[PDB]
Every structure is written in structure tokens, then in C-alpha cells.
């Protein structure tokens, strides 16, 4: 009985190929032909924030674009402030080895998480002064790689167990468990409207979730690596994901396949880091190599190279008014551009 | 200065500096390892004579120094994502047990192709090992009634206790083929003090040697 | 609970000597900027001292410096005030407030309740005006109160720095707005602020009985720090 | 046993299946569309002069 | 003559561009730089000034015969000589310093260290140096009372004068070999191996190179001046340029012998 249902599912896998190549007449760089390059963009190295001592592995802006977080490897998760260069904390962690940290859009808490395997959520704001643990929460079984806050009740978290989480913060129940991934899940993002979002595995695969009822939506399949970061298009129709083969693509939701693919002979090295700009005309990626690029995403040609780090950059994050963008890299220190 | 207040801001900062140096400076004294092995290799052990899911985190001290022990056999998760973040250890400790007999393909291969992946990591190609052969008496007892020549083919030489541990030590240290690394070898037994004075020795010759070395001595 | 308590006061001849203590339970002392804020008999507010985190900074009033000093023990949170040589323009009651002070924080949230000590017989100052003295109100209605500086509060940062308090019968004051804009936490949503740089004013929405004290105003664009007269509010 | 986790797939491919999609070309318009129309509204393709830059 | 003056002042082109080989493989390669390569770069810096300018002005001196230049502008290059040779010797000194506390404080040390504190370890070493030396040269002139110093040359004047010359020489050379010499000694003891090319021979190998380069070099210039103030004017030709091959051979000796410099063609 298995071979029938190996068979049924071959015919379907032809149907979705057969329906999406009929749903496509023509390439979106056809359609570009006509409107205008943007031309090279030069961006300088504003604010340098060295504070750390180990590696830099997460960052997170916060909502009024003047905040940020930082998590690294010396046991560390200490805001910042980007105009003036201050510390405004220094949050001691329990566990050494962090890979993701989160602000929450109200600006009352922050998360972080690691290969300890739990998600430590910390209140700011309290009246006895010094910052504190709400909660600790453990249901998984591998790795945290990367958290988002929804609101200030509930948290979404992607794990290296093949699954993701919904939480509910004060019962610390997960809520709703996400599943159907074939090995390990390291990247996430959630739409404008925070109804749906998407994450990316080591299967070459991303896919589209609905976090009221729970069920996998859409899947693309392009990459020919592990995923290693995504972001949505700011307007919640696409989206973009770095790999480890030097290519990043962008996926559109309506019409249900690729639409450009980004890479460049003089790179063999994997992405890191994906972002946009306000508008969604500029790409950003971080990279191996040590440096960062800017794509056209409408012409896919390079437009400048962010370089001036040390080492890899592993985090990347642009602000909710466009006016910088802040790269953090395992050299300890972290960049703002403009 | 036209900074106002916008004032006491800057204190708290400087205060909050302060505290991440002096909290740099006092775990600067600790020393990092990592612990690595396979299925039966008895890694146990060696963790059982140091404390007399996740990362665990063995803790002890020896002669007025700080020293941390990582095991992370039970990450069972893809292991190239989570290495990387274990780079900058000190040293790295291997266990390899002298029971190559039998089928998990062979446990010897296996142990010897591990440790060929680990050696030629991009990560560790500048870490040094340290390397624990275990089970010295069974594997004593053993060899009075089988040849090496089933772990290896190409085999040639006595069937006695010594020169068949030297084959294997050798065989080992074939793999290193970098010229900033050493690996240190102890042939550990159960019932065994001293196993931890092997480490403080090979952790002190391997902080001087960084330390030559970074200082342009050579 | 956060907990504030004074304690060492009485009558003294004049020419005398006196310690004061200020007993702090229930937060995270070593990490707070302490001030000394008194009030005559029956008169307004007056600031005395401060001292930093980590005892670095320390002002004084410039009627009190070099008879007054101000020390902290943070191992045993305990704030002190060592005075020499009293006058008897120095009746007054004491208070210990706590001044945190970071991007977006909440200065001089809590106060203390304080000490009564009495004696016996024997230019560029921001000053500030409350031109009215007292306002009878009617339950429900909707009052505006006043505060004029002299030197415009905006400084180059954007920010505007203009506190507002409120002193109930036989008790100690609040704190209710921040910077001008910002609501302290705690205080009921119907209170408001606005005003354009040196015209200041404080809007309250529905007013109820509970409500009914003393508002003072402060600055805190530079030291010293200068309060108003106080606009008092009364039933009918 | 895998009989239910093949049972599974087939069920989520079924599902996933029969889901309308647009034309391609309309789907490149959009996207052109709305970033020809926010091109005003971003600091960072057209530089932005030192007076009213905060990192400056 | 036409080839002393110009195949030595290839010396002075060959000191200049080679410590250039230096100061920019610093800035542009990156992975040589660390939080222990601001000494050398500031060695690279005074040995520079000194190729330049005193290598070419002494070259025209012995060629003349006698100083037509300036006879007040001497007292500049004198100072500027005098500065930067005390500043190279200062830098070898500290970097002597810095390699035992890294040896004998293996743990504590390198974290213990900031930017801060190898800039002023640097800026020390120069100041003390040129406070040392400048102020010397331009007064004991008066202390004089006649600038004895003619037209028929130019030299530092308190040449037989008291006993500032011994203090001079025994500070500027005999403080720091002593120095050297001992931690260089104790640090070589240090690197033995416990546990029982090898790594001792080939440490040894470069203490004995840095050693014998610099006490050869600066040997016979401070054993003439001694003797001389209680020399043939001759000698000199010699005893200067001894000086300024240990200029010229400090980018060689402490920074091609680490093995990533080399790479770095
Ligand atoms: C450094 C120096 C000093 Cl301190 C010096 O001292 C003067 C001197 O020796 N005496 C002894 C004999 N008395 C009659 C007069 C004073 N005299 C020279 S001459 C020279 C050079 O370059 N001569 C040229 C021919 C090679 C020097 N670098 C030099
Ligand atoms: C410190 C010192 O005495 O250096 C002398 C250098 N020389 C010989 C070029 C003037």
C-alpha cells in the first residue's frame, strides 16, 4: 500500500509543477527593461558600538527606531543607544551560547534563546529597578534559532527539533505546534499584518503558516542548500531567502513560485543575513566573505558593497523608517550605516 | 559639553563598561574545553573522575586553576551548525576506546574517520588534542586471543600488547597534517587516578605556546 | 513593597548638631540617584542635596553648602544628612526621593515620608512663577492649571524637562507627568500636559474629590533645581 | 505503520493543491507598482541631506 | 665618491620604503594586526624618520668635509637625531617587557591589556626620550657660557664636559641591555617543554638573532664616546652608520621573522 500512496503522491507533485508552469508567461526581469537603474548607492559607517567581548550572533531593532539589542557569546544581552552610543543595560545570562534575541514592538520586554533549549523572556520595565526573568520556557527538544514576539502575551519560536511553537507567555503552555519539516528549521519572519509567516529549513525548503488554525499553506522549493535567513517584501506578497550557495531568491505568494534569482560569479560564499529597505527597491544580504552587498530587487544587479568588518557578519536588521542599517559580525562590534 | 542631564546617563554607562570589564578580566581565568567521542567510547569515565537535555557543563579545579568541561553527545542535531560556536576552546578531548572487535561496519573505523572530520575541520585546524585511549587492561586481555590484522589490514609486526597500542597511537596521529597542532596521548585505565593531572600539563604547554607564538617569537 | 522611612528628628538649640537616616526595603538601592527635597511649616518646597550611584556627583543648595553633607552606605541601604551649626530658618520636614535616570525612565517616582525637625528661637536661578494661588472646583469639572519659567525649557536634544507633583492633606507628593508629555505610571489617564517653551499648563478631564491637594512644578535643566508656590485646589 | 504518515502527505499535498494563483506578469506589475509609488518615502536609495539626518 | 654617496643613499631609499613595507602591510592586510603590533608599528615610525632625514644630511656631512648647512640649524637635526634613537631603543625595551609579562602571566595578561595601555606604554617611551635628550643639547650651550661649537663642524657639545657624558652613555645604552638581556634569559628558560626543530631551539634561535644584532650594532659607537671625552675625527664615519644599519635592520629582525608577515609579499 505504501508504493500506491508513493505513486498518488507523484501525481500530485506533477499536478502543483504542471499548474505552476502554466501560471507563468514571462520573467520579471522581461518586464523591467524599461524603468531606470538606481545607481550605485554609498553608504558611510555612522555609529560603531564596541561594547562586547565574543562573538555577536543576534540583533534586534526596536520599534521607534532608536533601540537595539544585542546577544553574544560572552553571556551578554545588553540595549543599546544608536544616536548617542550609550548602554542603557546589561542583562546577565544564565547560558553562554545564544543564537537569536528579540524586542517586543511595546518596548516591555525582550527575549533570547540558545542551545540550552529554552526561551528566556525578561521584564524591563519593573518597578524594583533591575531587570528580571518572567518566565523559562522548555518544551523543545533541540536548539532555538530564531524568536519573534507578536504582542506581549504570545511569542513564536523555530527550533532545530524539525518543528516551531506558538506560546503563550503567562501560562507558559504551547499553544499550537507547527510540523512537517524534514530537518532542521533556522530562520522566521512574520508578516506586516501578523496572520501568517514563514521559516526556512536545512531541506532547501520554506514554507507558509497560518498561526490561528495551524496548517502549512504553501511550499517552495528552488535552493539546492540549507536556508539560512528570510524577510517579507513590505507589503506581505514576498519574500526573500539566503542559502548556504551563495544565492538568494525571491518567492511570491500569489503566484505561488520564483520569481528572481541573486548571485554573482565572484561568490561562493553563504548568506547570513537577508533584509529590505522601506520601499522593497534596495536588498540587503550579509555574507561569509566578510562583507555585505546591495541588490537591485527589480534589475538583480549589485548597486555597492557594505564592507569595514573583520570577521562574518552574522546579524542584519534595517529600521521601521529607513534611515539605517545596523550589521553585527563576529569581530564584537556592530555598524550603523546611512 | 551642552549635555544636560543627558548627564547622569553617561555615569550609568561608564558604570555599566566597568562591570562588563571587570567581569571579562575575572572569566578570563577559566579554561575552556570541549568533550567528544562515540557510542561505548566511555567518555563517561573520564567525566566520572572529574566531579568526584542540552550542554552540560562539568566543573572542577585543579591546582589553582579554573576549568570548564563541555559534553555535547547529547545535541543529537546537525552538527555543523552548532560547532562553530564552540570554536576558541582551548583544547579539544578525544576518546577512543581500545575495543575494535566488532560491528557498531567497524567501531575503530568509525572512531578513526571521526576523528579525520574533526581534525580537518575548518573551525579547529589550530586547536589542539588531546587524546585518551581507554580500556587498557581489556584490550590487554583481548589481544592474547586475536590479531590486529581484523581492525587493519595491512597489519604487519607482533601480536603483542605494546607494539599493537603504538600502531593504533600512530595511526591516529597521522591525521593532523598541520603544523600548528599537537596531539597528546595518554593510554588511560579504569581505576586510574591522575587523569586530570594529564590535562593540567598539556593546558599549560598549550597556553605558552599561543603565547609564544601570538608574540611574534618565533 | 517599596518603602522609604526617615528617622532622627527633634528639637535642637540653635547652634547645634543633628544626623539624619533614610531607610530604604524593596529595590535595587545601589542603582539609584537619592535627593533631599524639605518643606517649611507651612511654605513650598525646597531642594537641598543629591548624591549619585556610586556616590560620584554631588550638589548642594546654595543656601546650605558647607553647613550640610550627604553621604550613602549602600551595603547596608541607608542614606544619610550630617548638618552643623543650624539656623532657625532650617524648621522644616525631610524627604527622600529616588531620581533613576536613563533613555525613556520615570525621575523622581517615589517619596519618602519623611521627618519633622524644628529649632528654637534664633542670580541665575530659574526662578519660577504660579501666578494663581488657589482655584475652587466643583466635582466633575474640568480645570487648567498654569506654570511660567523664565528661561525656555527645549534644549538642542528635543527634549523639554518640566516634572509636576501633587501634595495631598497630610501626605507625601506624587509624581504625574514627566518631560512635559509623558504620563507617570499609575496616575489615572484623565491628566494631560501641553504648552510651547516657557508656558506650561496641566489639563485634568472629569475631576473627582480624590484629586484635591497642592500641584507644584519643577525644572530640571540645571542644577539647582526650582520649584513654584503651588497652586492649591479646594471643593466648592 | 507508515501507512498513516503516508496517508499524511498525500492529504497535505491534496490540500495544498488547490490553491488559485494569479498570472505571473500581474504579480511583477504589483511589485513595480508599489515600489514606484513608496520611492519618495525611502531614506536610504535617495540620500537624505545632514540637516534632518539624526546620526549625523 | 659619486658611488658612496649614492649606494649608500639607496641605504636611506632601501631603510624608508622597506619600514614602508611595514607601516602600510599593518594597515591594509589586517590579519597581521593584533593588540601587540602598535609597538612595532611605532619602531617602524621612528626608524622611517631616521632613514630619511639623518641618513641623507649625514651622507652630504662626511662627503664636505664640514657642516655648511646651518651653524644654528644643527641643533635641529641634533635633537631630531637623538629623539628617535632613544625612541627605538625605548621600543625595544618595552616590547622586552611585554613579551615576559605575556610568558610569565599566560592567563591574565592579554585580557588585562587595552589599546589604552599599549598607546601609553608608546607615548611614554617617546616623551621621556625626547624630554631626556632635547633640552640637554639646547642649553648646556649657556651652562657653557660660549658656544665652543665653530663653523669647522657640528657635534653635541658636551663632549669632555663633566660627567653628562657618562650618565648619557650609561643610561641610553647600558639601561636597556641589562634589561633585555635578563628578561631575554628568563624568557628563554621559560619555554622548555613539560611534558617529555623544537620549539625551545627555535625561540632560542631568534633571542640569540635580536640580541647579538643589537649589541654589535650600538657597541661601538657608546665604547668611543667614553674614552673620547677623557677618537682620529675619522672614526666617526664609522661609528654612525653602525647606528642606522640597526635602524635599517629592526624592520627585518622584529617583523619579518613572524610567519604571517612574510606571506604578505
Ligand atoms: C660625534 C662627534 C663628536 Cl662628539 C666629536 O667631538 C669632538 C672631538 O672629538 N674632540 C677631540 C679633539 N679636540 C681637539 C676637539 C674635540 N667630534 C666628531 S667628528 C665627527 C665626524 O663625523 N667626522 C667626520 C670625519 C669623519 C663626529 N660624528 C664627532
Ligand atoms: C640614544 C643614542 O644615543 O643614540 C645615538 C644615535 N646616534 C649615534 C645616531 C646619534
Known amino acids: 500500500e505504501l508504493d500506491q500512496l508513493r505513486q498518488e503522491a507523484e501525481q500530485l507533485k506533477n499536478q502543483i509543477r504542471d499548474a505552476r508552469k502554466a501560471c507563468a508567461d514571462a520573467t520579471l526581469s522581461q518586464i523591467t527593461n524599461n524603468i531606470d537603474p538606481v545607481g ?69 520586554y525582550v527575549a533570547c534563546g540558545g542551545l540550552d533549549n529554552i526561551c528566556s523572556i525578561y521584564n ?46 503567562e501560562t507558559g503552555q504551547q499553544t499550537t505546534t507547527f510540523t512537517g519539516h524534514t530537518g532542521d528549521v533556522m ?33 517552495f522549493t528552488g535552493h539546492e542548500s540549507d536556508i539560512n535567513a528570510i524577510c517579507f517584501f513590505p507589503n506581505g506578497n514576498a519574500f526573500a531567502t539566503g542559502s548556504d550557495d551563495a544565492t538568494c531568491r525571491l518567492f511570491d505568494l500569489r503566484a505561488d513560485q520564483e520569481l528572481m534569482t541573486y548571485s554573482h560569479d565572484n561568490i561562493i560564499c553563504g548568506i547570513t543575513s537577508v533584509s529590505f529597505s522601506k520601499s522593497g527597491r534596495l536588498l540587503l544580504a550579509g555574507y561569509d566573505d566578510f562583507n555585505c552587498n546591495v541588490w537591485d530587487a527589480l534589475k538583480a544587479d549589485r548597486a555597492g558593497v557594505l564592507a569595514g568588518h573583520d570577521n562574518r557578519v552574522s546579524c542584519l536588521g534595517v529600521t521601521d523608517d529607513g534611515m539605517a542599517v545596523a550589521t553585527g559580525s563576529w569581530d564584537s562590534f556592530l555598524k550603523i550605516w546611512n | 559639553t551642552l549635555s544636560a542631564e543627558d548627564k547622569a546617563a553617561v555615569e550609568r554607562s561608564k558604570m555599566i563598561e566597568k562591570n562588563l570589564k571587570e567581569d571579562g578580566i575575572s572569566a578570563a581565568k577559566d579554561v575552556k574545553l570541549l568533550l567528544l567521542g562515540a557510542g561505548e567510547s566511555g567518555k563517561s569515565t573520564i567525566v566520572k573522575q572529574m566531579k568526584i537535555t542540552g550542554i552540560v557543563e562539568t566543573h572542577f579545579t585543579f591546582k589553582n586553576l579554573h576549568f570548564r568541561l563541555f559534553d555535547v553527545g547529547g545535541q543529537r542535531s546537525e552538527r555543523k551548525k552548532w560547532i562553530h560556536c564552540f570554536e576558541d576552546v582551548t583544547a579539544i578531548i578525544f576518546c577512543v576506546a581500545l575495543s575494535g572487535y566488532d560491528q557498531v561496519t567497524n567501531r575503530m573505523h568509525e572512531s578513526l574517520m571521526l576523528f579525520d572530520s574533526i581534525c580537518n575541520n575548518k573551525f579547529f585546524i589550530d586547536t589542539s588534542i588531546i587524546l585518551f585511549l581507554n580500556k587498557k587492561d581489556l584490550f590487554g586481555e583481548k589481544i592474547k586471543k586475536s590479531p590486529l590484522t581484523i581492525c587493519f589490514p595491512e597489519y604487519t609486526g607482533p601480536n603483542t600488547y605494546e607494539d599493537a597500542a603504538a600502531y593504533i597511537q600512530a595511526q591516529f596521529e597521522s591525521k593532523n597534517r598541520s603544523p600548528n597542532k599537537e596531539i597528546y596521548c595518554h593510554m588511560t585505565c579504569a581505576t586510574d587516578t591522575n587523569n586530570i593531572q594529564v590535562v593540567f600539563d598539556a593546558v599549560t604547554d598549550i597556553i605558552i605556546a599561543n603565547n609564544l607564538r601570538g608574540c611574534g617569537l618565533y | 513593597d517599596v518603602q522609604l522611612v526617615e528617622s532622627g528628628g527633634g528639637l535642637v538649640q540653635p ?31 525646597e531642594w537641598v542635596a543629591y548624591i549619585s550611584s556610586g556616590s560620584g556627583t554631588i550638589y548642594y543648595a546654595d543656601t546650605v553648602k558647607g553647613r550640610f553633607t550627604i553621604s550613602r552606605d549602600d551595603p547596608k541601604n541607608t542614606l544619610f544628612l550630617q548638618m552643623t551649626s543650624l539656623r532657625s530658618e532650617d524648621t522644616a520636614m525631610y524627604y527622600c526621593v529616588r531620581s533613576i535616570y536613563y533613555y525613556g525612565s520615570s525621575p523622581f517616582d517615589f517619596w519618602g515620608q519623611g521627618t519633622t525637625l524644628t529649632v528654637s528661637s534664633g542670580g541665575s536661578d530659574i526662578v519660577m512663577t504660579q501666578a494663581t494661588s488657589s482655584v475652587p472646583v466643583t466635582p466633575g469639572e474640568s480645570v487648567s492649571i498654569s506654570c511660567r519659567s523664565s528661561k525656555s525649557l527645549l534644549h538642542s536634544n528635543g527634549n523639554t524637562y518640566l516634572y509636576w507633583f501633587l501634595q495631598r492633606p497630610g501626605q507625601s507628593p506624587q509624581l504625574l507627568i514627566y518631560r512635559m508629555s509623558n504620563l507617570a505610571s499609575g496616575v489615572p489617564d484623565r491628566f494631560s500636559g501641553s504648552g510651547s517653551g516657557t508656558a506650561f499648563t496641566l489639563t485634568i478631564s472629569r475631576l473627582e474629590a480624590e484629586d484635591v491637594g497642592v500641584y507644584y512644578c519643577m525644572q530640571h535643566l540645571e542644577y539647582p533645581l526650582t520649584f513654584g508656590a503651588g497652586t492649591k485646589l479646594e471643593l466648592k | 505503520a507508515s501507512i498513516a504518515q503516508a496517508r499524511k502527505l498525500v492529504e497535505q499535498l491534496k490540500m495544498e493543491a488547490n490553491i488559485d494563483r494569479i498570472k505571473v506578469s500581474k504579480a511583477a506589475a504589483d511589485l513595480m507598482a508599489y515600489c514606484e509609488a513608496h520611492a519618495k518615502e525611502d531614506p536610504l536609495l535617495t540620500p537624505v541631506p545632514a540637516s534632518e539626518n539624526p546620526f549625523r | ?190 619555554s622548555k617543554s613539560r611534558i617529555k626543530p623544537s620549539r625551545e631551539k627555535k625561540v632560542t634561535r631568534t633571542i640569540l638573532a635580536i640580541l647579538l644584532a643589537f649589541i654589535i650594532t650600538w657597541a661601538p659607537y657608546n665604547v668611543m664616546v667614553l674614552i673620547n671625552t677623557f677618537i682620529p675625527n675619522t672614526v666617526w664615519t664609522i661609528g654612525y652608520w653602525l647606528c642606522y644599519i640597526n635602524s635599517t635592520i629592526n624592520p627585518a629582525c622584529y617583523a619579518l621573522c613572524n610567519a604571517t608577515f612574510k606571506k604578505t609579499f
Not at chain 1, 74 to 102: E, F, Q
Not at chain 5, 113 to 136: E, N
Request: net charge positive.
Open chain 3, 15 to 45: 547652634g547645634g548638631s543633628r544626623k539624619l537616616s533614610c531607610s530604604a526595603s524593596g529595590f535595587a538601592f545601589s542603582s539609584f540617584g537619592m535627593h533631599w527635597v524639605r518643606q517649611a511649616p507651612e511654605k513650598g518646597l
Open chain 1, 187 to 219: 530562520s522566521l519572519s512574520l508578516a506586516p499584518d501578523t496572520r501568517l509567516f514563514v521559516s526556512g529549513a536545512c531541506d532547501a525548503s520554506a514554507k507558509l503558516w497560518d498561526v490561528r488554525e495551524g496548517m502549512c499553506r504553501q511550499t
Open chain 5, 1 to 190: 665618491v659619486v658611488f658612496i654617496v649614492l649606494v649608500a643613499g639607496s641605504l636611506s631609499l632601501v631603510t624608508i620604503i622597506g619600514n614602508i613595507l611595514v607601516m602600510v602591510s599593518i594597515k591594509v592586510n589586517r590579519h597581521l594586526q593584533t593588540v601587540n603590533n602598535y609597538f612595532l608599528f611605532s619602531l617602524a615610525c621612528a626608524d622611517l624618520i631616521i632613514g630619511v632625514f639623518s641618513m641623507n644630511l649625514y651622507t652630504l656631512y662626511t662627503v664636505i668635509g664640514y657642516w655648511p648647512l646651518g651653524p644654528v640649524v644643527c641643533d635641529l637635526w641634533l635633537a631630531l637625531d637623538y629623539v628617535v634613537s632613544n625612541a627605538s631603543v625605548m621600543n625595544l625595551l618595552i616590547i622586552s617587557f611585554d613579551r615576559y609579562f605575556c610568558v610569565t602571566k599566560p592567563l591574565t595578561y592579554p585580557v588585562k591589556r587595552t589599546t589604552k595601555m599599549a598607546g601609553m606604554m608608546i607615548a611614554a617611551a617617546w616623551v621621556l626620550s625626547f624630554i631626556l635628550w632635547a633640552p640637554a643639547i639646547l642649553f648646556w650651550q649657556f651652562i657653557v657660557g660660549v658656544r665652543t661649537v665653530e663653523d669647522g663642524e657640528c657635534y653635541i657639545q658636551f663632549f669632555s664636559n663633566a660627567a653628562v657624558t657618562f650618565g648619557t652613555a650609561i643610561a641610553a645604552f647600558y639601561l636597556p641591555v641589562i634589561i633585555m638581556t635578563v628578561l631575554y634569559w628568563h624568557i628563554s628558560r621559560a
Open chain 1, 124 to 169: 524591563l520595565k519593573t518597578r524594583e529597578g533591575n531587570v528580571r526573568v518572567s518566565r523559562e520556557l522548555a518544551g523543545h527538544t533541540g536548539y532555538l534559532s530564531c524568536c519573534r514576539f507578536l504582542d506581549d502575551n504570545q511569542i513564536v519560536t523555530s527550533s532545530g527539533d524539525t518543528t516551531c511553537a506558538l506560546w503563550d507567555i
Open chain 1, 40 to 108: 550605485r548607492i554609498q553608504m558611510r559607517t555612522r555609529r560603531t558600538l564596541r561594547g562586547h567581548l565574543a562573538k555577536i550572533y543576534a540583533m534586534h531593532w526596536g520599534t521607534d527606531s532608536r533601540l537595539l539589542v544585542s546577544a553574544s557569546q560572552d553571556g551578554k544581552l545588553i540595549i543599546w543607544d544608536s544616536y548617542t552610543t550609550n548602554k542603557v543595560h546589561a542583562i546577565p545570562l544564565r547560558s553562554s551560547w545564544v543564537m537569536t534575541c528579540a524586542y517586543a514592538p511595546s518596548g516591555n
